[PDB]
Amino acid sequence: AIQKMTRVRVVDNSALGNSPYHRAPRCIHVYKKNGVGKVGDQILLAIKGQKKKALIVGHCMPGPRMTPRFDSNNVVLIEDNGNPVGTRIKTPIPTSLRKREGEYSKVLAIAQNFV
Template sequence: MNVPLRKFLGQCSQAAGLHTSAPLEHIQKMTRLRVVDNSKLGKAAMLEGRPPRCIHVYNKTGIGHTGDKVLVAIKGQKKRGILVGCHQNQKPLMPKFDTNNLVLIEDNGMPLGNRIHVPIPTMLRKKLTDMSRPKGADYTKILAIATRFI
């Protein structure tokens, strides 16, 4: 493809309002997430068509993977959540999902909802039990409310 034609196609796509950048394959700031529990806040945001966006990922790299804790902006509030499924290339034995799934939690690790509607990876059991602390947050409640595992 010659250069003038490529430049012309780029201008046409910008004029039409189309995105020409490649999609990102990891969770970072401003990534849209899907709430998969039955919390009232999560249901309302998803029904409005304004899904939560990631504000911060609680790890050293700033890139979220399955099992990481994130801070999200949802309906004008800041809430924490656990990533229970990611749409990116995963490590071996970790399933790849169609969407970036999130379970909303309180500051002490208790989930806001009482049921998770999608299956969560079984490899997440070890990671969440390692993250739980006796006097801190207890993330094993997320495993208790999950109904299906992959």
């Protein structure tokens, strides 16, 4: 769904993600051997001239049945350890992400709405 050069939308409230910039956030690497990122995959972003890792929490490409499809490509900025940069995610995120609480426990804690 989300590959290199794909422009993404940061759905968290981090300052890095919401500050105005002349270039939109863009994917420059997907941490998957096939280079195609789906919900739950980490990607590298070129955002405000910096390199920051992000977690995909939604995309427009149809997925398996019974899974939500969003009108935008949504990502959440995280650190290398997996900690979220922001403190609140207002945009709804799929419940399927809760299968990955082992590694994404803190990111889920800041998610207000699930779909």
